[PDB]
Amino acid sequence: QSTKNETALLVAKSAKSALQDFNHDYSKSWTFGDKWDNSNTMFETFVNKYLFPKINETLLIDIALGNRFNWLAKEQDFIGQYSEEYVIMDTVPINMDLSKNEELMLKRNYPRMATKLYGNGIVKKQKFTLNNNDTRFNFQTLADATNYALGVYKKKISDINVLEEKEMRAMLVDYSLNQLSETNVRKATSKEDLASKVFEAILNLQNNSAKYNEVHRASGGAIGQYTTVSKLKDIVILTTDSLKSYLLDTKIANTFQIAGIDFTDHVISFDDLGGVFKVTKEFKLQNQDSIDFLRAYGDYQSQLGDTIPVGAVFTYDVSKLKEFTGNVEEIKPKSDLYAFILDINSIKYKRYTKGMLKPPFHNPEFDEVTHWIHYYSFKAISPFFNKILITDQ
Amino acid sequence: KNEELMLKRNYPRMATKLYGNGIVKKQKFTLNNNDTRFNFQTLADATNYALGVYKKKISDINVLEEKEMRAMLVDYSLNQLSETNVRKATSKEDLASKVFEAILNLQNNSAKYNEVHRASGGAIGQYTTVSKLKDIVILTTDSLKSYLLDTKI
Amino acid sequence: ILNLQNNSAKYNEVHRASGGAIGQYTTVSKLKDIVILTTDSLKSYLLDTKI
Amino acid sequence: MYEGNNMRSMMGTSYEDSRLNKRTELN
Amino acid sequence: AAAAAAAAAAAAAAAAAAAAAAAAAAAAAAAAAAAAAAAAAAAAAAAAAAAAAAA
Amino acid sequence: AAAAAAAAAAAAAAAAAAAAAAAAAAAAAAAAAAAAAAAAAAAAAAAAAAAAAAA
Amino acid sequence: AAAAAAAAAAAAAAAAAAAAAAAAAAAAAAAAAAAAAAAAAAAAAAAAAAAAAAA
Fold first, then answer.
1. Nearest 5 degrees, angle CA A34-CA A36-CA A38?
2. Chains F and A touch, contact meaning at least 3 pairs of CB atoms under 8 angstroms apart
3. Which of A214, B130, C45, G11 lies in disulfide reach of A383, CB 3.0 to 4.6 Å?
């Protein structure tokens, strides 16, 4: 429906707005004003029905958004790109069959090795741009503009934290699914079943097992075995928060001897274990609304025709775009029934944030100030430690 | 990419919601000096009457304010916060589990659990937030309060 | 457990010895000497259900 | 109102407005 | 993971006692799910209906 | 506000165990009110009678 | 001498929870003996069969 109210027609006449005085290279330079009415609007007072309304305050609601990981954050010093480690595989000893000829003691036996070569990290970048012309047409005082410029900076150093948090949980759920081949998955059957099966799996960390690790995709550890235990000061279990809620209201509640058997200190959790996405099929960008949707999240640098490599991530709901269906797959657990247990010092997280802020760039020919943020993160999973998945497969 | 990319503008996005005025509220009362004397045996109890009517004229605005404010909370609960924010219990012990998992939901880094998509700029984009658990407060009946304090705890 | 600490000849296997194929032999144990061997799954079942 | 690190680089000083020095010539 | 018992309570105005438990009625020994079921009374009524349908 | 279990006890000579509880029979899994009820056996007997009345 | 409750668990793949207890199904409120019984569902099915045999 429409409205025949004349001041509603005044609001609807967007030709006299300030937006038309910046899109075009020329404009009007004088204003005659207009008779503003308040009557038959949502803007009446009782006494003075001819004044433009007033705003008394804004408050700039901001939240600080932590990391939940940065005791993992150790700092290399940005030199070199390839790092690796390695183990020696086991050799079961052999019986003394003395019938063999004595000159085999001249023949040699080199020890065997399995390495895992990692490679470079990745550098993350974002821009933001403080204007001096359009943005101060708001902000009835300058103090609100200063709080605005401070708060956009504080939230653009909080978003990097929530970003690397969700892509860490992305990376180890992806390692939980596409790696960790056949033995160390365990099929539960219910939301209480895996509650028992997790400390079934706890105390399987601490037997000397050639299983439970991921040696069989190393360099030289394709054939052979390798045994490693854990220490229980080192194990990290993760799951949905609903699972640890069911733990903390059911088993440590309705039982009676929980003086020692409570493993809940090593339980980190999340609300949902997927908002993240993985590229397949190596598409390109074709459609306008796709990159317009990318502009809503800060992704400015991609245009139409720009390719996407298969190893990238997208960290928010992007698969609903028409150009990504079939190409893009969500890293998520299958059944909302998830418990991935490992040990710490099996994940490697290592970032470089020393030269983090860059000097600001002042653009006088449109009067803005632009800031960049750079940091060099690296993360991987070392495959030489005991890990167990529990889902419904 | 091309080296002239640095002079591209990346404005920050905001999401707003406006609020109207409040209500000024008024109450009056009139004391008398001539016939009021015909209903007391001292001057002291008449002064007690005069102070009692005044402290009840502040006590009534107290009780008025609190029950209208819980009324607008229930109004919001029925008429706002579209279906993604509301979860459905079944039994009266069901929500004992639901609230215990929900308070543990709210204190994780999530874009969920708010209704900023009802706000102006929040239709597209993302807004992640948490809660501190010194800041969450829950709102039920006193019957469900009793059903906590006698059954589970 | 505490089948073991009764005087019984049913719990050994002395019939597989050389000179002791037929006939019995009673023995007991002292609880400083019984250990059980199991897998970890029902060990965990002991460590939540029975305790 | 809240400062944190308020006087940061060039834009946080550019709203804390700067140097009315040159004005137009007649008055 | 518990139970209850009444030996009373004819299940007309009971409001907040338990769910998925057993509420022993004065006659019927009902069971309280999300809605209250009438197990032993259902057995007696099924026996009476099977006797009535034996014409 | 408790329960019990037997997996035995064919309910002929049981005297003082419980009331308004569940006594798991060797076949029937009975329920002990002020008189003992036979819930699962009542379900099986009602199924057999409904099968017999299907002539 | 205890009990349990689910309000879930459609009794297809449950393995090791309890025996001679009550497993509240999502629809049926089953009972777990050495084999699982379906008491309230048995009452509903006996009522439906007694209604069908009323021709």
1. 170
2. no
3. A214
